[PDB]
Amino acid sequence: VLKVYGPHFASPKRALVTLIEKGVAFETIPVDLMKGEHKQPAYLALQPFGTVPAVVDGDYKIFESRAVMRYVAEKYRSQGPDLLGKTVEDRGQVEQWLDVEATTYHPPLLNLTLHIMFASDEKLIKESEEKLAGVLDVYEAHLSKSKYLAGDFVSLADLAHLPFTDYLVGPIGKAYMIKDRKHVSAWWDDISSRPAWKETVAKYSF
Amino acid sequence: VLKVYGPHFASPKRALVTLIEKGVAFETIPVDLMKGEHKQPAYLALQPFGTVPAVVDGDYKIFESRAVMRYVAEKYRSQGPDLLGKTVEDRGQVEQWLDVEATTYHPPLLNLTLHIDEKLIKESEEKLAGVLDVYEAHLSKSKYLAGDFVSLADLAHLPFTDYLVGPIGKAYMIKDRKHVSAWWDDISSRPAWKETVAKYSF
Numbered sequence: 001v002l003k004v005y006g007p008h009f010a011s012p013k014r015a016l017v018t019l020i021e022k023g024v025a026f027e028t029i030p031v032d033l034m035k036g037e038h039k040q041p042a043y044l045a046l047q048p049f050g051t052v053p054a055v056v057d058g059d060y061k062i063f064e065s066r067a068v069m070r071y072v073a074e075k076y077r078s079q080g081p082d083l084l085g086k087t088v089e090d091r092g093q094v095e096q097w098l099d100v101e102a103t104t105y106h107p108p109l110l111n112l113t114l115h116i117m118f119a120s121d122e123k124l125i126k127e128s129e130e131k132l133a134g135v136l137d138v139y140e141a142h143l144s145k146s147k148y149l150a151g152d153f154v155s156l157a158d159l160a161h162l163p164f165t166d167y168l169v170g171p172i173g174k175a176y177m178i179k180d181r182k183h184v185s186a187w188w189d190d191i192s193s194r195p196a197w198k199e200t201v202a203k204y205s206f
Numbered sequence: 207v208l209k210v211y212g213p214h215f216a217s218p219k220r221a222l223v224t225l226i227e228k229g230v231a232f233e234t235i236p237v238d239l240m241k242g243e244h245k246q247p248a249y250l251a252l253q254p255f256g257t258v259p260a261v262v263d264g265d266y267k268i269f270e271s272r273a274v275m276r277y278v279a280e281k282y283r284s285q286g287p288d289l290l291g292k293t294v295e296d297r298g299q300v301e302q303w304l305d306v307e308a309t310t311y312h313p314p315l316l317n318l319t320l321h322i323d324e325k326l327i328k329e330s331e332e333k334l335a336g337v338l339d340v341y342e343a344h345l346s347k348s349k350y351l352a353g354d355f356v357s358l359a360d361l362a363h364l365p366f367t368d369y370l371v372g373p374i375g376k377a378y379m380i381k382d383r384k385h386v387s388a389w390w391d392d393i394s395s396r397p398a399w400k401e402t403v404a405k406y407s408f
């Protein structure tokens with residue numbers, strides 16, 4: 001059975017929500033980051049960068065949360081929603097917005113997340129919020145003409161935004177970044193209410 | 207008919223080398239970044255984030271350099287080498303290291319590329335060095351990043367690492383790590399990369 005390491009943290013929930021969306025059986029294994037368990041040789045053999053998640057599926061091992069999403073969505077492509085889309089063109093749009101999350105949306109969000117948890121670099125915080133807001137403005141324009149990021153179907157690209165945006169509008173206290181943008185807000189309301197996400201949060205929150 | 211915008215810049219070279227490896231016909235279109243053309247309405251209609259590359263393939267439009275690599279590699283899968291691997295598990299490993307490149311390798315390297323801030327530079331180098339130590343242990347056991355076959359994961363490292371070992375003056379980060387060095391020598395001497403560089407250097 002597929003095993004996911006570090007379910008209580010945010011990046012692993014990208015994989016968990018995908019697993020739950022595809023109806024794939026899995027177990028989770030905690031990793032004690034606060035006591036540095038992830039920097040010890042045992043976990044480093046699973047994830048050489050010492051970060052979570054790592055996934056072991058029998059003899060097969062894979063890390064990087066969005067790679068795991070792609071692996072699960074391709075391996076179990078025929079069951080559940082097709083989170084990769086149907087055509088090569090569809091998958092292209094999915095890969096596109098997934099990389100937008102990885103390279104453009106997530107990094108400034110992570111900086112706000114970390115540096116507001118540090119109360120810190122107040123210049124970095126101001127820059128990170130503005131960069132993120134700039135990204136959300138693009139999303140806003142895009143989502144006003146497209147139901148989901150990759151098209152008229154929900155995909156890995158959308159699911160990838162769930163764990164850290166949830167943090168953003170919750171304990172970080174910046175719900176206005178989502179709320180003040182009408183189309184983004186409706187999109188967020190839609191994907192964050194999907195049963196797979198509700199189950200992920202109910203089961204694996206701090 | 208497939209068109210690539212901004213060939214003289216580094217990220218677009220991830221797409222170009224993939225296009226050349228796969229034997230795909232394409233045209234290129236310059237984008238004048240220094241005059242701010244990429245921030246004007248015309249290019250923004252192609253890439254709403256105002257960065258290069260953007261790709262237009264007939265009526266189909268796609269951006270993000272690594273997404274373009276994936277799209278090309280899948281659409282033209284049967285021709286040239288299979289840069290996605292053969293199985294679902296192979297592709298998983300390719301996606302894994304492609305994301306390591308996007309999220310772990312490239313961000314500190316990009317800081318070096320841009321700023322060459324004193325502290326940011328020192329920190330980016332240390333961070334990139336730590337990343338390269340992991341590459342070194344891994345490549346001592348695996349011929350390429352994703353396994354015993356060359357893939358998109360390897361190719362994605364070509365454009366900015368070319369900067370690193372050249373104009374940046376930090377070839378030692380690659381050279382001092384035996385397995386990384388041999389791996390780099392290998393992928394950067396592939397004819398598709400030589401052609402990319404020969405044709406599209408700024």
Ligand SMILES: N[C@@H](CCC(=O)N[C@@H](CS(=O)(=O)O)C(=O)NCC(=O)O)C(=O)O
Pocket residue numbers: 009010011012033038050051052053063064065066309
């Ligand atoms: N690109 C990696 C990043 C994973 C990552 O950084 N995880 C964090 C935890 S969290 O951001 O997802 O909550 C971590 O392990 N931090 C440990 C450390 O850096 O020491 C992925 O997405 O899998």
Ligand SMILES: N[C@@H](CCC(=O)N[C@@H](CS(=O)(=O)O)C(=O)NCC(=O)O)C(=O)O
Pocket residue numbers: 103215216217218239244256257258259269270271272
């Ligand atoms: N995530 C994007 C990043 C694209 C990007 O930032 N391109 C740079 C050019 S380069 O880094 O590849 O040389 C750019 O357009 N910079 C212009 C700007 O942001 O104003 C991708 O990989 O396609």
Ligand SMILES: [Cl-]
Pocket residue numbers: 005006007008009029030031032
């Ligand atoms: Cl955990």
Ligand SMILES: [Cl-]
Pocket residue numbers: 211212213214215235236237238
């Ligand atoms: Cl150009």
